[PDB]
Design an enzyme around this catalytic site. Structure first.
Site, PDB file in Angstrom:
ATOM      1  N   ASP A 167     -31.602 -50.020  23.129  1.00  0.00           N
ATOM      2  CA  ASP A 167     -31.036 -48.681  23.012  1.00  0.00           C
ATOM      3  C   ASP A 167     -30.774 -48.049  24.377  1.00  0.00           C
ATOM      4  OD1 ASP A 167     -30.036 -46.570  21.566  1.00  0.00           O
ATOM      5  OD2 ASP A 167     -31.852 -46.294  20.372  1.00  0.00           O
ATOM      6  N   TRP A 192     -24.677 -50.113  24.620  1.00  0.00           N
ATOM      7  CA  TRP A 192     -24.022 -49.776  25.882  1.00  0.00           C
ATOM      8  C   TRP A 192     -22.761 -48.902  25.728  1.00  0.00           C
ATOM      9  CZ3 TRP A 192     -22.695 -54.182  29.961  1.00  0.00           C
ATOM     10  CH2 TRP A 192     -22.231 -53.586  31.140  1.00  0.00           C
ATOM     11  N   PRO A 193     -21.775 -49.327  24.908  1.00  0.00           N
ATOM     12  CA  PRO A 193     -20.564 -48.496  24.871  1.00  0.00           C
ATOM     13  C   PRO A 193     -20.760 -47.129  24.210  1.00  0.00           C
ATOM     14  CG  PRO A 193     -20.402 -50.263  23.269  1.00  0.00           C
ATOM     15  CD  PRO A 193     -21.658 -50.514  24.039  1.00  0.00           C
ATOM     16  N   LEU A 194     -21.683 -47.030  23.258  1.00  0.00           N
ATOM     17  CA  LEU A 194     -21.936 -45.770  22.559  1.00  0.00           C
ATOM     18  C   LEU A 194     -22.392 -44.659  23.504  1.00  0.00           C
ATOM     19  CD1 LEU A 194     -22.296 -43.940  20.124  1.00  0.00           C
ATOM     20  CD2 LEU A 194     -24.488 -45.059  19.661  1.00  0.00           C
ATOM     21  N   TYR A 195     -23.309 -44.988  24.407  1.00  0.00           N
ATOM     22  CA  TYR A 195     -23.837 -44.002  25.344  1.00  0.00           C
ATOM     23  C   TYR A 195     -22.908 -43.813  26.541  1.00  0.00           C
ATOM     24  CZ  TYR A 195     -28.218 -44.328  22.746  1.00  0.00           C
ATOM     25  OH  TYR A 195     -29.175 -44.301  21.758  1.00  0.00           O
ATOM     26  N   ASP A 210     -24.761 -43.021  14.877  1.00  0.00           N
ATOM     27  CA  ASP A 210     -25.629 -43.551  13.826  1.00  0.00           C
ATOM     28  C   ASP A 210     -25.062 -43.358  12.430  1.00  0.00           C
ATOM     29  OD1 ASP A 210     -27.259 -44.014  15.957  1.00  0.00           O
ATOM     30  OD2 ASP A 210     -28.816 -42.574  15.365  1.00  0.00           O
TER      31      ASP A 210
HETATM   32  O1  LIG Z   1     -33.806 -44.616  18.133  1.00  0.00           O
HETATM   33  C1  LIG Z   1     -32.450 -44.439  18.301  1.00  0.00           C
HETATM   34  C2  LIG Z   1     -31.572 -44.359  17.105  1.00  0.00           C
HETATM   35  C3  LIG Z   1     -32.118 -45.220  16.032  1.00  0.00           C
HETATM   36  O2  LIG Z   1     -33.489 -45.260  16.130  1.00  0.00           O
HETATM   37  C4  LIG Z   1     -31.600 -46.613  16.130  1.00  0.00           C
HETATM   38  O3  LIG Z   1     -32.297 -47.302  17.094  1.00  0.00           O
HETATM   39  C5  LIG Z   1     -30.125 -46.758  16.352  1.00  0.00           C
HETATM   40  O4  LIG Z   1     -29.495 -46.938  15.142  1.00  0.00           O
HETATM   41  C6  LIG Z   1     -29.436 -45.651  17.092  1.00  0.00           C
HETATM   42  N1  LIG Z   1     -30.191 -44.483  17.412  1.00  0.00           N
HETATM   43  C7  LIG Z   1     -29.465 -43.420  18.042  1.00  0.00           C
HETATM   44  S1  LIG Z   1     -30.197 -41.985  18.456  1.00  0.00           S
HETATM   45  N2  LIG Z   1     -28.070 -43.644  18.290  1.00  0.00           N
HETATM   46  C8  LIG Z   1     -27.188 -42.688  18.896  1.00  0.00           C
HETATM   47  C9  LIG Z   1     -27.048 -42.607  20.248  1.00  0.00           C
HETATM   48  C10 LIG Z   1     -26.112 -41.612  20.846  1.00  0.00           C
HETATM   49  C11 LIG Z   1     -25.388 -40.783  20.039  1.00  0.00           C
HETATM   50  F1  LIG Z   1     -24.553 -39.896  20.571  1.00  0.00           F
HETATM   51  C12 LIG Z   1     -25.534 -40.875  18.559  1.00  0.00           C
HETATM   52  C13 LIG Z   1     -26.390 -41.785  18.016  1.00  0.00           C
END
Ligand SMILES: OC[C@@H]1[C@H](O)[C@H](O)[C@@H](O)CN1C(=S)Nc1ccc(F)cc1
Ligand SMILES: *[C@@H]1O[C@H](CO)[C@@H](O[C@@H]2O[C@H](CO)[C@@H](O)[C@H](O)[C@H]2NC(C)=O)[C@H](O)[C@H]1NC(C)=O
Ligand SMILES: *[C@@H]1O[C@H](CO)[C@@H](O[C@@H]2O[C@H](CO)[C@@H](O)[C@H](O)[C@H]2NC(C)=O)[C@H](O)[C@H]1NC(C)=O
Ligand SMILES: OC[C@@H]1[C@H](O)[C@H](O)[C@@H](O)CN1C(=S)Nc1ccc(F)cc1
Ligand SMILES: *[C@@H]1O[C@H](CO)[C@@H](O)[C@H](O)[C@H]1NC(C)=O
Ligand SMILES: *[C@@H]1O[C@H](CO)[C@@H](O)[C@H](O)[C@H]1NC(C)=O
Ligand SMILES: *[C@@H]1O[C@H](CO)[C@@H](O)[C@H](O)[C@H]1NC(C)=O
Ligand SMILES: *[C@@H]1O[C@H](CO)[C@@H](O)[C@H](O)[C@H]1NC(C)=O
Lengths: 390, 391
Positions: free
Chosen positions: A139, A173-176, A200
């Site tokens: 993550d 990686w690309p999401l963040y 998510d």
């Molecule tokens: O803990 C992070 C959380 C979950 O627990 C899972 O690990 C993953 O499915 C993704 N996740 C998160 S916050 N993802 C996310 C990261 C940035 C964003 F702008 C929106 C969603």
């Protein structure tokens, strides 16, 4: 990522969407994130035909860690919730012929506040390998700079290779990176087996639509990069839970196959309807997802609250998905010239078309001159397989 | 409106949400608005136990009309889609012990562009009566001013009365009034058997959440007005279609019972799952909706993605609905002191609590001091019945 793994999209089970960060083992011992939970899913993956269907990776998401690292700076499983440790859990999962995924974070903490891997990329990688871990979801929370993010994902990728163990590498990686600058997917593919592109998922039709809409909108940037060893990850399958109608579940199964997506179920295998089970275990549709060619599908056209998606398969076959995005009324008729399908070679001079979803039904031979006619349920999807007559 | 009708919330079937304005009978004969559709729907209401369940009114929505009026200024059913006419259709429906509803508009077009009733309120009302119509859904499209809107709804109410025929009068009056000034529900209750308050429902969890949220937001404005002969109408039941999960279907049924709403199904009785059928035909839940007291329920509390609703029933009984609005994760625990339910008189000194949804299960005796403990699925609803008792 060229490590010999994920030559087809990874298939398995991930706990996050359904079980999240439940630590209440005293009042909810059966739903809390614990060694017992994963033991139970492992047994059912074997006994209920999930492994036979391709679901091979049993993956732990966030909230498995102890609050702190041990005295030697290594990560710890929670002493109360994972009392036998991760290595022993991995030994058990392997004994049933499955593989184990685990979770860590490039930043200073995981998203749920537990120890991050920044500053520990090498020791954490070796720790994972020593445990017998077969997959890593990495993550991107609590990371200050864009550079530390890119450096961290790369550093960990190389760190895994140098352990000598085959470990499927999952990146966010690309999401963040997206809200700051556009990603280099060629660079990302270089280091990652799959990569999360979008926000998510949760248990809703709204979420599914948002993922489909983001993918089709950005497809000229992400479709061609996908292939054996490197896939786009539009997040978990939520089929079998509470928020999707049957037709919306069908839409997710069909379209995640079209998109050549990793199939990580997030549900409760202890409590799943026969209907949802049969869909998730649909061999013909899974086979489309698992097509050896590994070319991601795309959105052909879009209008009148209809969407047409298609994916080229091995052996001159094509998969076609038609979605009805109109959320009122009944099943609507949609018609398309088969010559417009498969870039014009799918049904030239003819093709045999087989409907796979919502039900399996042979439609017959279609000539180059023919039109495909279908009725699609609101929020539902019709999935077809086209076999060229030559 | 006390014309002796709708002493309990009206129950039946309305074609709009599922079939809308399909006029293509040649390429979509199974979905087009025609006499055959309603004839077949009529047969199934009888044969599949819908009538025995209380679903009594077979209602025609918009798009039944010919493009314009006959030589005598009267409305016409479409000659191709309704070649045998409304009178013969009403006769057919009555022969099966059901009642027939029809649709008109205060303006001078219906919403789908067919002949409106402005300037024809009396002749149109008399036409309906001569046809044997038992219910009128009165729409508000293509109406210019507040006063023409208000006068039209009033006039038709009186126009129907003067026919001498019993005709349930369904209004969309307050919905079309909102964009001008807030409605006077006292005036509306005077003229209408039930009234649509908010935008059209569709086949989605979004629409249901949207209806529930505005109803609870405006409840101190509309709840007390509801009662025998005059109900709030939060639009059709869409259970049995395509856009709702099982738990979301449960939520609509439970809350439409809580709200003392008219239960107009909009689905295809020819193609409905056994599960959706059993839910829609749930006698215990229907009985709550049809409670003789006729007091509309309300939202008790709201927080942490939870909602608690309750409705006072006849004989010191209460219905309680607990909703989980969190759309991620699994079943959530919710706990409430039973003394906080039914304004403190439901379990005084005790009550027997029976769960009705998602499954029927007797929970047992709860004393005034005790706590009710429950687990609710995401987007689902737990529906409870509390019977006041001495033990
Ligand atoms: O803990 C992070 C959380 C979950 O627990 C899972 O690990 C993953 O499915 C993704 N996740 C998160 S916050 N993802 C996310 C990261 C940035 C964003 F702008 C929106 C969603
Ligand atoms: C470490 O990376 C190298 C490549 O950088 C991987 O070697 C590749 O392995 C596949 C199949 O095993 C071969 O088809 C490629 O030709 C190899 N590439 C090179 C450059 O040798 C190696 O498998 C990785 N190691 C681990 C443990 O993942
Ligand atoms: C027309 O309106 C009158 C006025 O309300 C209705 O008469 C009432 O009928 C109910 C039950 O039938 C009685 O309890 C009331 O006492 C009546 N009121 C008066 C003032 O007589 C009448 O039923 C209506 N007729 C139609 C056909 O709608
Ligand atoms: O044709 C009008 C349409 C249907 O056909 C039925 O008559 C009713 O269910 C309501 N309806 C419409 S557009 N209702 C409406 C929905 C939103 C709004 F702001 C004003 C009116
Ligand atoms: C981790 O925290 C330290 C201390 O604040 C900071 O200097 C460093 O940049 C952080 N690392 C990341 C990847 O955010
Ligand atoms: C992105 O892909 C690779 C990864 O490093 C790199 O060689 C290439 O030059 C990059 N392209 C752009 C336009 O940045
Ligand atoms: C109905 O028609 C008349 C004449 O065209 C017009 O004055 C009126 O505004 C129309 N619409 C109404 C009353 O809603
Ligand atoms: C609303 O109710 C009646 C309806 O005619 C009316 O007489 C009354 O004055 C109105 N109330 C208010 C507060 O305007």
């Amino acid at each position: 990522l060229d490590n010999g793994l994920a030559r087809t999209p990874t298939m398995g089970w991930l706990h996050w969407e359904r079980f999240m960060c439940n630590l209440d083992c005293q009042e909810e011992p059966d739903s809390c994130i614990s060694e017992k939970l994963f033991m139970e899913m492992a047994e059912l993956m074997v006994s209920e035909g999930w492994k036979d269907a391709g679901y091979e990776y049993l993956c732990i998401d966030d909230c498995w860690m102890a609050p702190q690292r041990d005295s030697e700076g290594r990560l710890q499983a929670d002493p109360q919730r994972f009392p036998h440790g991760i290595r022993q859990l991995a030994n058990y999962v392997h004994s049933k012929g499955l593989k184990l995924g685990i979770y860590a974070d490039v930043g200073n903490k995981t998203c749920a506040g537990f120890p991050g891997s920044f500053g520990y990329y090498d020791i954490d990688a070796q720790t994972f390998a020593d445990w017998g871990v077969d997959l890593l979801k990495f993550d991107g929370c609590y990371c200050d700079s864009l550079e530390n993010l890119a450096d961290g994902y790369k550093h960990m990728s190389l760190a895994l290779n140098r352990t000598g163990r085959s470990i499927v590498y999952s990146c966010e990686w690309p999401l963040y990176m997206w809200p700051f600058q556009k990603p280099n997917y060629t660079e990302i593919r270089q280091y990652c087996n799959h990569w999360r592109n979008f926000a998510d998922i949760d248990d809703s039709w709204k979420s599914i639509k948002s993922i489909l809409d983001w993918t089709s909108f950005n497809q000229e940037r992400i479709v061609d990069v996908a292939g054996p060893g490197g896939w786009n990850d539009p997040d978990m399958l939520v089929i079998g839970n509470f928020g999707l109608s049957w037709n919306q579940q069908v839409t997710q199964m069909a379209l995640w196959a079209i998109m050549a997506a990793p199939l990580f179920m997030s549900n409760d295998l202890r409590h799943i309807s026969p209907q949802a089970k049969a869909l998730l275990q649909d061999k013909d549709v899974i086979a489309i997802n698992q097509d050896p060619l590994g070319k991601q599908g795309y959105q052909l056209r879009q209008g009148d609250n209809f969407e047409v998606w298609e994916r080229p398969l091995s052996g001159l076959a094509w998969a076609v998905a038609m979605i009805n995005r109109q959320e009122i009324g009944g099943p609507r008729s949609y018609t398309i010239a088969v010559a417009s399908l498969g870039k014009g070679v799918a049904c030239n001079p003819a093709c045999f078309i087989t409907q796979l979803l919502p039900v399996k039904r042979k439609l017959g031979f279609y000539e180059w001159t023919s039109r495909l006619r279908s009725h699609i349920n609101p929020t539902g999807t019709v999935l077809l397989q086209l076999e060229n007559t030559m």
